[PDB]
Amino acid sequence: MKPHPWFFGKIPRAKAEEMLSKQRHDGAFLIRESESAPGDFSLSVKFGNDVQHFKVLRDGAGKYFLWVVKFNSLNELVDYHRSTSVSRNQQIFLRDIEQV
């Protein structure tokens, strides 16, 4: 049943970058809460020695999406991206951060 190892709450973008920069695996990721836009989420993802960020977009129905596919929950958006690329330019699949 366990809590998700990917939800970091309100941490600055820069701290997300610092933390993901230390991770060894492409796709290592977290979800954080925006410091600028109340109630909004962002997804930060290790790729090489870069950290890609994606904005979690909302529609009028309160779905969560990145691109076109609409999700009922952050949990469903995250899990879908474990096996479909979060990136349009590169194959990047999300994988849980390592606590090391």
Side-chain angles (χ1 to χ4, degrees), residues 40-64:
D40 278 4
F41 294 100
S42 298
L43 169 63
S44 293
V45 186
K46 185 192 194 74
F47 187 60
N49 54 58
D50 200 24
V51 176
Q52 292 190 9
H53 304 285
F54 302 78
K55 187 172 175 70
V56 181
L57 300 174
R58 299 308 285 291
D59 61 18
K63 312 300 188 195
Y64 295 102

PDB file of all heavy atoms in Angstrom, residues 40-64:
ATOM      1  N   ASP A  40      -0.636  24.248  -8.456  1.00  0.00           N
ATOM      2  CA  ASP A  40      -0.160  23.615  -9.720  1.00  0.00           C
ATOM      3  C   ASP A  40       1.022  22.708  -9.411  1.00  0.00           C
ATOM      4  O   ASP A  40       1.707  22.900  -8.402  1.00  0.00           O
ATOM      5  CB  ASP A  40       0.341  24.631 -10.757  1.00  0.00           C
ATOM      6  CG  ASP A  40      -0.784  25.275 -11.594  1.00  0.00           C
ATOM      7  OD1 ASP A  40      -1.997  25.045 -11.376  1.00  0.00           O
ATOM      8  OD2 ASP A  40      -0.382  26.045 -12.474  1.00  0.00           O
ATOM      9  N   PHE A  41       1.252  21.729 -10.298  1.00  0.00           N
ATOM     10  CA  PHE A  41       2.249  20.670 -10.122  1.00  0.00           C
ATOM     11  C   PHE A  41       3.210  20.761 -11.296  1.00  0.00           C
ATOM     12  O   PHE A  41       2.838  21.240 -12.396  1.00  0.00           O
ATOM     13  CB  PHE A  41       1.598  19.276 -10.090  1.00  0.00           C
ATOM     14  CG  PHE A  41       0.716  19.086  -8.873  1.00  0.00           C
ATOM     15  CD1 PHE A  41      -0.643  19.228  -9.039  1.00  0.00           C
ATOM     16  CD2 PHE A  41       1.254  18.868  -7.592  1.00  0.00           C
ATOM     17  CE1 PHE A  41      -1.530  19.144  -7.937  1.00  0.00           C
ATOM     18  CE2 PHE A  41       0.384  18.718  -6.472  1.00  0.00           C
ATOM     19  CZ  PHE A  41      -0.991  18.857  -6.643  1.00  0.00           C
ATOM     20  N   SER A  42       4.433  20.307 -11.054  1.00  0.00           N
ATOM     21  CA  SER A  42       5.399  20.155 -12.091  1.00  0.00           C
ATOM     22  C   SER A  42       6.130  18.841 -11.951  1.00  0.00           C
ATOM     23  O   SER A  42       6.285  18.338 -10.845  1.00  0.00           O
ATOM     24  CB  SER A  42       6.435  21.306 -12.023  1.00  0.00           C
ATOM     25  OG  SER A  42       5.766  22.568 -12.235  1.00  0.00           O
ATOM     26  N   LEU A  43       6.646  18.326 -13.068  1.00  0.00           N
ATOM     27  CA  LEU A  43       7.258  17.036 -13.112  1.00  0.00           C
ATOM     28  C   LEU A  43       8.668  17.264 -13.566  1.00  0.00           C
ATOM     29  O   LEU A  43       8.906  17.924 -14.621  1.00  0.00           O
ATOM     30  CB  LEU A  43       6.528  16.167 -14.161  1.00  0.00           C
ATOM     31  CG  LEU A  43       7.159  14.835 -14.563  1.00  0.00           C
ATOM     32  CD1 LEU A  43       7.287  13.790 -13.396  1.00  0.00           C
ATOM     33  CD2 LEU A  43       6.316  14.161 -15.690  1.00  0.00           C
ATOM     34  N   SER A  44       9.599  16.770 -12.776  1.00  0.00           N
ATOM     35  CA  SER A  44      11.053  17.006 -13.091  1.00  0.00           C
ATOM     36  C   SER A  44      11.709  15.664 -13.338  1.00  0.00           C
ATOM     37  O   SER A  44      11.525  14.662 -12.576  1.00  0.00           O
ATOM     38  CB  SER A  44      11.719  17.789 -11.927  1.00  0.00           C
ATOM     39  OG  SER A  44      11.199  19.134 -11.829  1.00  0.00           O
ATOM     40  N   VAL A  45      12.515  15.609 -14.420  1.00  0.00           N
ATOM     41  CA  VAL A  45      12.974  14.324 -14.951  1.00  0.00           C
ATOM     42  C   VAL A  45      14.420  14.392 -15.376  1.00  0.00           C
ATOM     43  O   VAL A  45      14.805  15.241 -16.194  1.00  0.00           O
ATOM     44  CB  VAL A  45      12.161  13.849 -16.193  1.00  0.00           C
ATOM     45  CG1 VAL A  45      12.603  12.411 -16.593  1.00  0.00           C
ATOM     46  CG2 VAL A  45      10.695  13.891 -15.874  1.00  0.00           C
ATOM     47  N   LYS A  46      15.215  13.487 -14.818  1.00  0.00           N
ATOM     48  CA  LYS A  46      16.628  13.368 -15.229  1.00  0.00           C
ATOM     49  C   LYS A  46      16.774  12.845 -16.675  1.00  0.00           C
ATOM     50  O   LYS A  46      16.223  11.732 -17.043  1.00  0.00           O
ATOM     51  CB  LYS A  46      17.399  12.461 -14.200  1.00  0.00           C
ATOM     52  CG  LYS A  46      18.904  12.478 -14.626  1.00  0.00           C
ATOM     53  CD  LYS A  46      19.802  11.475 -13.987  1.00  0.00           C
ATOM     54  CE  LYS A  46      21.290  11.884 -14.260  1.00  0.00           C
ATOM     55  NZ  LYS A  46      21.599  13.050 -13.404  1.00  0.00           N
ATOM     56  N   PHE A  47      17.556  13.607 -17.513  1.00  0.00           N
ATOM     57  CA  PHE A  47      17.983  13.071 -18.795  1.00  0.00           C
ATOM     58  C   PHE A  47      19.483  13.459 -19.073  1.00  0.00           C
ATOM     59  O   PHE A  47      19.766  14.605 -19.362  1.00  0.00           O
ATOM     60  CB  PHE A  47      17.126  13.587 -19.970  1.00  0.00           C
ATOM     61  CG  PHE A  47      17.481  12.896 -21.240  1.00  0.00           C
ATOM     62  CD1 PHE A  47      17.342  11.500 -21.321  1.00  0.00           C
ATOM     63  CD2 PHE A  47      18.075  13.611 -22.300  1.00  0.00           C
ATOM     64  CE1 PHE A  47      17.732  10.805 -22.522  1.00  0.00           C
ATOM     65  CE2 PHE A  47      18.477  12.937 -23.492  1.00  0.00           C
ATOM     66  CZ  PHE A  47      18.321  11.558 -23.598  1.00  0.00           C
ATOM     67  N   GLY A  48      20.415  12.529 -18.877  1.00  0.00           N
ATOM     68  CA  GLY A  48      21.872  12.822 -19.096  1.00  0.00           C
ATOM     69  C   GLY A  48      22.315  13.785 -18.014  1.00  0.00           C
ATOM     70  O   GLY A  48      21.912  13.648 -16.840  1.00  0.00           O
ATOM     71  N   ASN A  49      23.081  14.826 -18.362  1.00  0.00           N
ATOM     72  CA  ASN A  49      23.361  15.752 -17.302  1.00  0.00           C
ATOM     73  C   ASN A  49      22.483  17.002 -17.456  1.00  0.00           C
ATOM     74  O   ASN A  49      22.920  18.124 -17.327  1.00  0.00           O
ATOM     75  CB  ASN A  49      24.896  15.936 -17.037  1.00  0.00           C
ATOM     76  CG  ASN A  49      25.654  16.321 -18.265  1.00  0.00           C
ATOM     77  OD1 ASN A  49      25.360  17.341 -18.888  1.00  0.00           O
ATOM     78  ND2 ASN A  49      26.676  15.564 -18.582  1.00  0.00           N
ATOM     79  N   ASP A  50      21.195  16.743 -17.716  1.00  0.00           N
ATOM     80  CA  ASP A  50      20.177  17.755 -17.746  1.00  0.00           C
ATOM     81  C   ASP A  50      18.971  17.305 -16.891  1.00  0.00           C
ATOM     82  O   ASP A  50      18.834  16.128 -16.590  1.00  0.00           O
ATOM     83  CB  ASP A  50      19.694  18.021 -19.168  1.00  0.00           C
ATOM     84  CG  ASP A  50      18.996  19.405 -19.279  1.00  0.00           C
ATOM     85  OD1 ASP A  50      19.292  20.314 -18.424  1.00  0.00           O
ATOM     86  OD2 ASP A  50      18.123  19.551 -20.167  1.00  0.00           O
ATOM     87  N   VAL A  51      18.148  18.270 -16.491  1.00  0.00           N
ATOM     88  CA  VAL A  51      16.888  17.943 -15.771  1.00  0.00           C
ATOM     89  C   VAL A  51      15.838  18.608 -16.647  1.00  0.00           C
ATOM     90  O   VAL A  51      15.847  19.843 -16.865  1.00  0.00           O
ATOM     91  CB  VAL A  51      16.882  18.458 -14.310  1.00  0.00           C
ATOM     92  CG1 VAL A  51      15.472  18.137 -13.692  1.00  0.00           C
ATOM     93  CG2 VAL A  51      17.981  17.768 -13.452  1.00  0.00           C
ATOM     94  N   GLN A  52      14.935  17.797 -17.175  1.00  0.00           N
ATOM     95  CA  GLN A  52      13.824  18.317 -17.983  1.00  0.00           C
ATOM     96  C   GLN A  52      12.659  18.562 -17.008  1.00  0.00           C
ATOM     97  O   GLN A  52      12.452  17.750 -16.033  1.00  0.00           O
ATOM     98  CB  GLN A  52      13.440  17.279 -19.008  1.00  0.00           C
ATOM     99  CG  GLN A  52      14.571  17.058 -20.117  1.00  0.00           C
ATOM    100  CD  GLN A  52      14.059  16.209 -21.265  1.00  0.00           C
ATOM    101  OE1 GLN A  52      12.859  15.916 -21.346  1.00  0.00           O
ATOM    102  NE2 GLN A  52      14.973  15.791 -22.164  1.00  0.00           N
ATOM    103  N   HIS A  53      11.916  19.639 -17.228  1.00  0.00           N
ATOM    104  CA  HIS A  53      10.727  19.892 -16.431  1.00  0.00           C
ATOM    105  C   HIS A  53       9.523  19.900 -17.358  1.00  0.00           C
ATOM    106  O   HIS A  53       9.539  20.522 -18.451  1.00  0.00           O
ATOM    107  CB  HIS A  53      10.776  21.264 -15.740  1.00  0.00           C
ATOM    108  CG  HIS A  53      11.991  21.469 -14.867  1.00  0.00           C
ATOM    109  ND1 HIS A  53      12.124  20.865 -13.632  1.00  0.00           N
ATOM    110  CD2 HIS A  53      13.153  22.138 -15.087  1.00  0.00           C
ATOM    111  CE1 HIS A  53      13.298  21.194 -13.102  1.00  0.00           C
ATOM    112  NE2 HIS A  53      13.952  21.947 -13.974  1.00  0.00           N
ATOM    113  N   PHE A  54       8.437  19.323 -16.872  1.00  0.00           N
ATOM    114  CA  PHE A  54       7.163  19.357 -17.571  1.00  0.00           C
ATOM    115  C   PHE A  54       6.106  20.001 -16.667  1.00  0.00           C
ATOM    116  O   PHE A  54       5.996  19.683 -15.463  1.00  0.00           O
ATOM    117  CB  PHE A  54       6.716  17.928 -17.935  1.00  0.00           C
ATOM    118  CG  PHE A  54       7.702  17.196 -18.782  1.00  0.00           C
ATOM    119  CD1 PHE A  54       8.884  16.630 -18.190  1.00  0.00           C
ATOM    120  CD2 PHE A  54       7.456  17.037 -20.111  1.00  0.00           C
ATOM    121  CE1 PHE A  54       9.855  15.970 -18.993  1.00  0.00           C
ATOM    122  CE2 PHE A  54       8.404  16.370 -20.935  1.00  0.00           C
ATOM    123  CZ  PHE A  54       9.543  15.832 -20.369  1.00  0.00           C
ATOM    124  N   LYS A  55       5.289  20.898 -17.244  1.00  0.00           N
ATOM    125  CA  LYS A  55       4.199  21.477 -16.454  1.00  0.00           C
ATOM    126  C   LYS A  55       2.972  20.562 -16.436  1.00  0.00           C
ATOM    127  O   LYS A  55       2.545  20.111 -17.506  1.00  0.00           O
ATOM    128  CB  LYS A  55       3.785  22.840 -17.003  1.00  0.00           C
ATOM    129  CG  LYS A  55       2.721  23.611 -16.076  1.00  0.00           C
ATOM    130  CD  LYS A  55       2.534  25.030 -16.604  1.00  0.00           C
ATOM    131  CE  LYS A  55       1.441  25.741 -15.824  1.00  0.00           C
ATOM    132  NZ  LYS A  55       2.008  25.971 -14.450  1.00  0.00           N
ATOM    133  N   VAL A  56       2.423  20.273 -15.235  1.00  0.00           N
ATOM    134  CA  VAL A  56       1.192  19.437 -15.172  1.00  0.00           C
ATOM    135  C   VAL A  56       0.040  20.386 -15.470  1.00  0.00           C
ATOM    136  O   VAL A  56      -0.217  21.311 -14.698  1.00  0.00           O
ATOM    137  CB  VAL A  56       1.061  18.687 -13.873  1.00  0.00           C
ATOM    138  CG1 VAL A  56      -0.226  17.848 -13.935  1.00  0.00           C
ATOM    139  CG2 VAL A  56       2.328  17.807 -13.636  1.00  0.00           C
ATOM    140  N   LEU A  57      -0.560  20.218 -16.642  1.00  0.00           N
ATOM    141  CA  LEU A  57      -1.582  21.153 -17.111  1.00  0.00           C
ATOM    142  C   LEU A  57      -2.946  20.662 -16.606  1.00  0.00           C
ATOM    143  O   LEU A  57      -3.094  19.464 -16.303  1.00  0.00           O
ATOM    144  CB  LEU A  57      -1.566  21.232 -18.615  1.00  0.00           C
ATOM    145  CG  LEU A  57      -0.265  21.695 -19.252  1.00  0.00           C
ATOM    146  CD1 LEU A  57      -0.355  21.593 -20.762  1.00  0.00           C
ATOM    147  CD2 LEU A  57      -0.041  23.140 -18.768  1.00  0.00           C
ATOM    148  N   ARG A  58      -3.882  21.604 -16.398  1.00  0.00           N
ATOM    149  CA  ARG A  58      -5.274  21.259 -15.967  1.00  0.00           C
ATOM    150  C   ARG A  58      -6.292  21.722 -17.009  1.00  0.00           C
ATOM    151  O   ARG A  58      -6.053  22.675 -17.719  1.00  0.00           O
ATOM    152  CB  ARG A  58      -5.616  21.947 -14.609  1.00  0.00           C
ATOM    153  CG  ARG A  58      -4.723  21.555 -13.445  1.00  0.00           C
ATOM    154  CD  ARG A  58      -4.628  20.068 -13.263  1.00  0.00           C
ATOM    155  NE  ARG A  58      -5.818  19.418 -12.668  1.00  0.00           N
ATOM    156  CZ  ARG A  58      -6.233  19.563 -11.397  1.00  0.00           C
ATOM    157  NH1 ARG A  58      -5.568  20.400 -10.562  1.00  0.00           N
ATOM    158  NH2 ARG A  58      -7.333  18.920 -10.976  1.00  0.00           N
ATOM    159  N   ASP A  59      -7.406  21.031 -17.164  1.00  0.00           N
ATOM    160  CA  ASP A  59      -8.420  21.585 -18.039  1.00  0.00           C
ATOM    161  C   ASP A  59      -9.598  21.923 -17.134  1.00  0.00           C
ATOM    162  O   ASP A  59      -9.509  21.852 -15.883  1.00  0.00           O
ATOM    163  CB  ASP A  59      -8.805  20.632 -19.189  1.00  0.00           C
ATOM    164  CG  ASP A  59      -9.389  19.295 -18.708  1.00  0.00           C
ATOM    165  OD1 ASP A  59      -9.822  19.192 -17.530  1.00  0.00           O
ATOM    166  OD2 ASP A  59      -9.416  18.337 -19.557  1.00  0.00           O
ATOM    167  N   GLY A  60     -10.712  22.290 -17.759  1.00  0.00           N
ATOM    168  CA  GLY A  60     -11.866  22.693 -17.007  1.00  0.00           C
ATOM    169  C   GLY A  60     -12.547  21.626 -16.201  1.00  0.00           C
ATOM    170  O   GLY A  60     -13.370  21.927 -15.259  1.00  0.00           O
ATOM    171  N   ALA A  61     -12.256  20.386 -16.585  1.00  0.00           N
ATOM    172  CA  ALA A  61     -12.773  19.228 -15.936  1.00  0.00           C
ATOM    173  C   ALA A  61     -11.884  18.803 -14.794  1.00  0.00           C
ATOM    174  O   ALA A  61     -12.225  17.863 -14.116  1.00  0.00           O
ATOM    175  CB  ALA A  61     -12.893  18.074 -16.963  1.00  0.00           C
ATOM    176  N   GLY A  62     -10.761  19.495 -14.577  1.00  0.00           N
ATOM    177  CA  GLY A  62      -9.775  19.080 -13.560  1.00  0.00           C
ATOM    178  C   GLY A  62      -8.976  17.844 -13.940  1.00  0.00           C
ATOM    179  O   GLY A  62      -8.370  17.203 -13.074  1.00  0.00           O
ATOM    180  N   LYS A  63      -8.934  17.471 -15.234  1.00  0.00           N
ATOM    181  CA  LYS A  63      -8.029  16.392 -15.612  1.00  0.00           C
ATOM    182  C   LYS A  63      -6.606  16.981 -15.466  1.00  0.00           C
ATOM    183  O   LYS A  63      -6.423  18.193 -15.462  1.00  0.00           O
ATOM    184  CB  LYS A  63      -8.179  15.932 -17.060  1.00  0.00           C
ATOM    185  CG  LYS A  63      -9.611  15.666 -17.494  1.00  0.00           C
ATOM    186  CD  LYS A  63     -10.181  14.554 -16.584  1.00  0.00           C
ATOM    187  CE  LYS A  63     -11.525  14.149 -17.120  1.00  0.00           C
ATOM    188  NZ  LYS A  63     -12.321  13.346 -16.112  1.00  0.00           N
ATOM    189  N   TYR A  64      -5.641  16.072 -15.403  1.00  0.00           N
ATOM    190  CA  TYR A  64      -4.188  16.412 -15.354  1.00  0.00           C
ATOM    191  C   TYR A  64      -3.677  15.929 -16.706  1.00  0.00           C
ATOM    192  O   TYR A  64      -3.987  14.829 -17.126  1.00  0.00           O
ATOM    193  CB  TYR A  64      -3.540  15.607 -14.225  1.00  0.00           C
ATOM    194  CG  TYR A  64      -4.008  15.947 -12.834  1.00  0.00           C
ATOM    195  CD1 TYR A  64      -4.931  15.119 -12.160  1.00  0.00           C
ATOM    196  CD2 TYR A  64      -3.493  17.038 -12.159  1.00  0.00           C
ATOM    197  CE1 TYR A  64      -5.304  15.427 -10.844  1.00  0.00           C
ATOM    198  CE2 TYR A  64      -3.915  17.394 -10.896  1.00  0.00           C
ATOM    199  CZ  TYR A  64      -4.827  16.540 -10.237  1.00  0.00           C
ATOM    200  OH  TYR A  64      -5.242  16.795  -8.954  1.00  0.00           O
TER     201      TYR A  64
END
